[PDB]
Design a binder for this molecule. Structure first.
Ligand SMILES: O=C([O-])C(=O)[O-]
Ligand SMILES: O=C([O-])C(=O)[O-]
Ligand SMILES: O=C([O-])C(=O)[O-]
Ligand SMILES: O=C([O-])C(=O)[O-]
Ligand SMILES: [Mg+2]
Ligand SMILES: [Mg+2]
Ligand SMILES: [Mg+2]
Ligand SMILES: [Mg+2]
Lengths: 291, 291, 289, 289
């Protein structure tokens, strides 16, 4: 069934669902083959892989293109981390159109200003979007959809910006009232206190998504206990990939030889396998003169 | 000094030089920080990361764009693996122009047909380009350069295609006579016999580059002994990166928790560090109203 | 209604249908407003507007992005002139999937080699693709489409390459048998004799498309009499735009004033209307708090 | 000679210089052939030709790729109309580095918010950027260029936004002090009174650029008398091209024939000449074995 429908069911299941980050077509295929039911198109990981910062440096179409290759390499839905929507309601609704066309399942937008600053920094400025304004941006995206199953997740940055539960709840309520398919409540505390607080006051008004990067020590069953609908593992493949490349590059640099890595890395045939080279081999058998 | 000049010196040093593969801006930065003096813009790794095959599926401008992000993230030269030049002499000379503009240091072109098939496959067809034709393609690229230090490496695929030393030498001689900055002699044997054979007959007519992926057991000092000018570690960061992502994704998938990977992967701050987030922090200090 | 279907109906209709060249989003929208039921995404015109040659210099993705903007600005189908398919069957089938996703209604592939040379050149070598290979490339595109109505037009360049009816017919038959939704029979003659001979020998095996650029004085009812399914007006909007820009630029350059061009060009409000600025105005009243 | 230098000489010259709007590689090459010494990479015209609005819908990289093709097709400098810089100082400085790499000679940034609205609209809100912030954005672009001759033009939208000379002058002075190579003072009046008043109060602090679109009946020598350094013909080639396409399409649509357009548009050989096909012919004799 449609990737959009797959993601919507997930956001709406009372069951706790999990999406894993991917940041390129290769990693999207890997996450798929692992069994994950959804993919998180991480804004940080996509910017990082390109070698730029997570501050809207690469253009929205450069992001979308990375996402197109990812969509093509995967059968499970991708929820794009669309930052603040790359501009106003009009830039956001144009983004949704391009997203739908590429097979991307949903877009997550955070209530800050363009260009944004990664939520994980401390001390940095985290100005928030006006509430009525942001809600209308959420509504324009929903209003503008062609496929009714496409998802719009509204990310509340109130705790991240030093505001309280009061603000967090007003904005979550507003975004939900504007048609958001789920609310992503964010927090950068090493514990889940902001989340516990929010979930308690929310009174299960709608599905809630969380990103436990900072409070990763919290047992997952606690999230189930709170009634969270989905958890996003945000940037670990990007992070694992950097450890590997630094370790590998240093070893080859030091040895001036491949002997100490050849057996610690996937083979060339595994690469060809993940690129689905065999399919092409079938196709050439069928579409090229035998002689 | 120019990245082009840096690469040219390397190809011309009698000293054995080493370039390491990178396939995105993040990995190009990592290879740089490791001490490598050059980067191999692997056609396989760039296609693989995008989730496609190494058969000219992504367009040449999609490849060039990945390469632009890589160039921007690095101070050392990048030698692009330009497949067969993405078409005829005209498609190749247009490519050189775009390459020079992006700060890419050189392009390597192999003597096969567009679209190509990865040299590492066995049994697959590996038709070779006509010799006079290919040589003229090499000359048009050199002829068409603006920066005289830009490098054109001619990759001979004769051994790869099942031909002998005789063919390999005629084509190497032709490509060198056409102005190539070095000849990349290829082989997929688990030993360096084709290379030993070629080096013996070449009589050090010009610089020779090799890719020891398949005969990786050969001691590097043997290459020095043969008078090889450069060695290319072709696809190991891509390969290390896939092992890491598969391992990481499987662990999180199984645990439904981050506990068993958080300490096995680079931190978020290391990510911010490789994106040079601090530079931006300086810049905002300088270009944004304090209040 | 659906673009691929609209284009497939036109190729299959008994009546002579017409599509007009557009080369950017603006020209596609003008073509639609004029009433044309389809657009020819001219390779010559897309390459020319970019300032490059009709020699596969711009990549296939740069062509596809121009086409995406064109598709976004129109409701009628666009038939892309996809040269030789930008490489082999695999390059063609990847292109078909991207075109379907961007809303393009079909692709037209010609039986020459990558990179190609424009058909209108006199004396330029026009090496033809092997018949079997090209027919397998057509079948590949057909086998790979996900919209059953997406069309694939196979263009025969035999007459263009200096060959005869024999070659042209063998080629057209192979491609049709491969599954082409229509055959584009090409000729650079100032008369329609190559087309007449082909139409006679064809026995109406399937829909035929033609491009009267060089034999334009031929009365259009004659094409109808021949059973021709579609005519393409191939590069006239591009050519008209160059005349217009060349004139306006010269005028302003000479006068160092706009007084003599201001009354001869459309108003800025017309540009806004063509850009659909009123739709933004309506969205802004809903969504700008 | 070098494009950035050529553009910097024009801004600094005492004489009234002129640049003409181009919106794609083809129009840039025509503009150059006409003799113009520089090109205005119009935001309105680039967006319009794509079929989208002048509201930062196309991304900044899509605009930059149109500009790259334009730059590749011309020897004279292009001044890009870069709207508000496509975001904050960081988005502007990244854009400057890409423009330098693609051969673009300079950027023109206006003191409004991202995403912007075209200045010519009547009644549309035109919220201005904070003076200090915008001045720091200009300084950032200046601090970040690697070619010292690359130009940065700061556009003052005060009059456009409904403000007075006071606001317009404070803004122009801040930006100039920030390092702008020239100030573009804008007005949508049918007369040049806003420009006259500004020029009087300016005391020739630095080069001023103007865009006479709405006050075009003003005699050009009057701008010279005012000490104006450069005039931009902002959207006339785009507007001329729409008139031409609209006419040609209608004609062909009505006639279902090319006989009445064939004699009114440039030849296919002219398109080849503009594409520089003869250069390919010369390369093919050297390099095609
Ligand atoms: O960018 C990301 O991964 C995020 O915001 O979670
Ligand atoms: O693509 C590659 O890495 C190669 O050819 O070595
Ligand atoms: O490019 C074109 O317009 C053609 O081939 O007809
Ligand atoms: O977009 C344009 O042409 C302008 O602002 O002048
Ligand atoms: Mg993010
Ligand atoms: Mg390769
Ligand atoms: Mg064509
Ligand atoms: Mg503008």
């Amino acid at each position: 069934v449609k990737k959009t429908t797959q993601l919507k069911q997930m956001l709406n299941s009372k069951d706790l669902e999990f999406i894993m980050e991917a940041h390129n077509g290769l990693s999207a295929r890997i996450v798929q083959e692992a069994g994950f039911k959804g993919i998180w198109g991480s804004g940080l990981s996509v910017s990082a892989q390109l070698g730029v910062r997570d501050s809207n440096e690469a253009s929205w179409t450069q992001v979308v293109e990375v996402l197109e290759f990812m969509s093509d390499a995967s059968d499970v839905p991708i929820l794009l981390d669309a930052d603040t929507g790359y501009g106003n309601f009009n830039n956001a609704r144009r983004l949704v159109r391009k997203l739908e066309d590429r097979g991307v399942a949903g877009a997550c937008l955070e209530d800050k200003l363009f260009p944004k600053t990664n939520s994980l920094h401390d001390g940095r400025a985290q100005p928030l979007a006006d509430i009525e304004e942001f809600a209308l941006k959420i509504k324009a995206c929903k209003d503008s959809q062609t496929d009714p199953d496409f998802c719009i997740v509204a990310r509340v940055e109130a705790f991240i910006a030093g505001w309280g539960l009061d603000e967090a709840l007003k904005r979550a309520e507003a975004y939900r009232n504007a048609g958001a398919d789920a609310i992503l409540m964010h927090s950068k505390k090493a514990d889940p206190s902001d989340i516990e607080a929010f979930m308690k006051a929310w009174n299960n008004q709608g599905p809630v998504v969380i990103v436990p990067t900072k409070y990763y020590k919290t047992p997952t069953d606690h999230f189930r206990d709170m009634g969270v609908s989905m958890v996003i593992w945000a940037n670990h493949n990007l992070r694992a990939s950097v450890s590997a490349i630094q370790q590998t590059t240093k070893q080859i640099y030091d040895d001036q030889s491949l002997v100490n890595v050849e057996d610690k890395i996937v083979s060339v045939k595994e690469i060809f396998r993940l690129q689905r080279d065999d399919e092409l081999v079938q196709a050439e058998d069928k579409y090229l003169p035998k002689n």
